[PDB]
């Protein structure tokens, strides 16, 4: 595909202004929950490496890890959804503007299509 050269694109914007027209991801999104799980695993591994009680060494540190992971994951999900929306928009626009390359296939019914039958013996 390559959208780097796409027209009217700002050089260092994480989320353009046109991205705000899309529904934001919910706070109960499964991907956000997985990011929180990743942060919790990072906290547990941090506790284990420092030779501390893994489950209950630092509650504030684990909370900070989970919150940071959730925050970054939310913004990443927003950007990903925007990029896929752009891909679909460009696809549909190109299909609209080039009718000769995407003709309507003449619909055909199976009762009048001859398919070879291969017996299993």
């Amino acid at each position: 595909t390559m959208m780097s050269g796409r027209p009217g694109r700002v050089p260092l914007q994480f989320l353009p202004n046109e991205a705000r027209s899309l529904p934001p991801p919910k706070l109960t999104d499964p991907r956000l929950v997985y990011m929180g799980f990743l942060g919790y695993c990072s906290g547990l591994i941090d506790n284990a490496i420092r030779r501390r009680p893994v489950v209950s060494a630092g509650l504030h540190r684990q909370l900070l890890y989970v919150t940071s992971f959730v925050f970054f994951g939310y913004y990443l999900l927003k950007r990903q959804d925007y990029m896929y929306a752009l891909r679909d928009h460009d696809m549909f626009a190109y299909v609209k503007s080039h009718p000769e390359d995407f003709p309507e296939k003449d619909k055909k019914t199976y009762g009048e299509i001859l398919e070879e039958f291969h017996p299993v013996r």
């Binding site: 390559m2 997985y34 490496i49 420092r50 990903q80 990029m83 891909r87």
Partner: protein
């Protein structure tokens, strides 16, 4: 050296890389490469000894030759078209010269010979920096001119790098040479998708950087540079060995680990372009990297090697310094496969 001088040199290396990444003039890219080379040598030679000096002079010779070739390619491109902007190369000969220079900078085969020796000579921190940060600038330059590369040469050197890394990692007992051959193989994987998709190249670069950071930080934590020295790690800090085994399994491309993401996506993208044989050979060859990763895991964590009496004192002491982000790097290099569709962010 003085910590102020070390910080200034690290900032100069990073600023040279950023100058390469942000400039649109070929002369400025060359200047960024020169600045990075100039500031890199003391970092490699930080712990003064004959081995570090030999590694530094080998690295200097290789990088100076590559920079001279790159300058020659720029001058030929200017000769055949009065252009300084980094765009389409405009000349077949200029493109060939530039590709070889960037391969020499990256260490792609057949220009791989310097990587294992330079990595063995330098310490583990210099090895981490050399194998992680020193790949950004040449890969970015290759990405900017990916539409000009001849696919035959790029694919040939990529497959050669994969084969060379797989074969050369089998023969090593030193951990740094193993990491160097792994880096060569991963570079070969990265450059086999530039003709088709640069997003896959960047995704592979990010995944490999995370995995390599995790592995080098684990090796620094348990100060071992040989297989037998790492075989003593279970008797003091078994958690480090278990995490290292999981990271090694991830680096071998075994699903559902994070390391399966780049190979999967690259194979899928290459198949979209009616290329079938090369991904099959590439996976077959990556089996060798997985094999020597498994040998390291066997020697490290899955079995218990004999220990020594003097480990009883080491049992009584704790690490004075704890490396931040080690936990984050392990998790990111282990458990990010379900987040695969996030690559559309043009990472």
């Amino acid at each position: 050296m003085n910590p102020i001088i070390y910080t200034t040199l690290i900032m100069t290396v990073m600023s040279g890389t950023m100058l390469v990444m942000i400039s649109s003039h070929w002369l400025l890219i060359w200047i960024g490469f020169e600045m990075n080379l100039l500031a890199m040598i003391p970092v490699l030679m930080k712990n003064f000894n004959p081995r570090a000096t030999e590694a530094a002079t080998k690295y200097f010779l290789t990088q100076a030759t590559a920079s001279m070739m790159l300058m020659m390619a720029i001058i030929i491109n200017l000769l055949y078209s009065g252009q300084w902007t980094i765009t389409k190369m405009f000349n077949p000969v200029a493109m060939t010269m530039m590709t070889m220079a960037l391969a020499m900078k990256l260490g792609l085969s057949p220009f791989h010979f310097w990587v294992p020796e330079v990595t063995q000579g330098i310490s583990l921190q210099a090895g981490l920096l050399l194998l992680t940060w020193q790949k950004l600038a040449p890969l970015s330059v290759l990405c900017q001119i990916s539409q000009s590369i001849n696919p035959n040469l790029m694919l040939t050197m990529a497959m050669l790098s994969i084969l060379i890394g797989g074969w050369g990692g089998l023969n090593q007992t030193q951990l740094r040479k193993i990491m160097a051959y792994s880096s060569i193989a991963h570079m070969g994987w990265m450059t086999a998708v530039l003709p088709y998709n640069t997003t896959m190249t960047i995704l592979n670069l990010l995944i490999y950087i995370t995995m390599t950071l995790a592995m080098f930080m684990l090796l620094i934590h348990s100060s071992a540079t040989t297989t037998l020295s790492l075989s003593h790690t279970w008797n003091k800090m078994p958690v480090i060995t278990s995490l290292m085994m999981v990271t090694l399994l991830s680096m071998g491309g075994l699903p559902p680990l994070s390391g399966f993401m780049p190979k999967w996506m690259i194979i899928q993208e290459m198949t979209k372009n009616e290329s079938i044989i090369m991904p099959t050979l590439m996976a077959m060859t990556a089996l060798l990297n997985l094999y020597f990763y498994m040998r390291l895991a066997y020697s490290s964590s899955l079995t218990m090697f004999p220990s020594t009496n003097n480990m009883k004192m080491k049992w009584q002491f704790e690490h004075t310094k704890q490396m931040k982000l080690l936990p984050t790097m392990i998790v990111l290099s282990t458990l990010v496969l379900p987040m695969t569709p996030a690559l559309s962010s043009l990472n």
